[PDB]
């Protein structure tokens, strides 16, 4: 749908910070084609615009039906802060459905003076020739500012559902809603559908959600660390903690060998599951320590990464 110019909100970088300049890594010809197709459609719809030679910023993109993912980590660090509470009962619910509500953002303009800092490049084959440069004209998915700016509209949209379903907990984290109830699974799913239809009535398309059942699964609100380690061979272990001695949670996953898997793919799965669990339990995304070289991770992680968010991580 079309945007409303009066919903443009002024935004800026943190004092004395410039915009991001993180280079586009090489992509496969398949991924480049997909990005060209996606970006040609976004441009036709006014959501991005080609930029000229003056703009010096850059944020990396990649492709994962294909979807474009932007790694806004550096822009997010440089973006101003914005002036939710996590329900302790969300993890006690029989079911929690996660819904991606990032589609909302395409309908909301981005401050024209901030657009330049969202510049990105569709790379050429092997990065041999200059790529195709674009910036965002609307709130971008994965950008810190987008859920903050949309919160007032999200609240107005959710209000009738919340008023009619007091037994349902709705917690928002970044670009997702976590919808929790103790209903029979069929009844819970019906409430999810009613919620998706409400969102859609207001122009918010959502993917099918993914279902958690966390009642089958000393925190200090002031950073979370998740460490994954190799346990011999054959399985993975992880520790979630803030101070080194006391763990808050520990767990295991299998480290399987096969023609369709590898350590990076499995580690990305584990990162996504530990993150989701951490958001549910504590409302925080951990920083990760992964049992792999940075070079091998930096090489391959984008090949399997299905999340719209991207956490911070260290290595051996
Ligand atoms: O990847 N990059 O960071 C990047 C950046 C610029 N630039 O103007 O700041 C480019 O012109 C290109 N380029 O044209 O391929 C790439
Ligand atoms: O397409 N590209 O994103 C691209 C990227 C880079 N770079 O170093 O990141 C280049 O140097 C060139 N290049 O040299 O044309 C192109
Ligand atoms: O291909 N290029 O012409 C090119 C140009 C610029 N630039 O800022 O003028 C870059 O930053 C990059 N880059 O960072 O890859 C590439």
Author numbering: 0 to 63, 70 to 88, 94 to 218, 231 to 239, 318 to 322, 324 to 417
Question: What does the report in the manuscript say about this coordinate set?
Answer:
Formation of active HIV-1 reverse transcriptase (RT) proceeds via a structural maturation process that involves subdomain rearrangements and formation of an asymmetric p66/p66′ homodimer. The viral RNA codes for a p66 protein that forms an asymmetric homodimer in which the RNase H domain in one subunit becomes destabilized, leading to subsequent unfolding and proteolysis in order to form the active p66/p51 heterodimer. We utilized the isolated polymerase domain, p51, rather than p66, since the initial subdomain rearrangements are largely limited to this domain. Two different fingers/palm/connection (FPC) subdomain constructs containing the same interfaces that are present in the monomers and in the p51 subunit of the RT heterodimer were investigated using both NMR spectroscopy and X-ray crystallography.
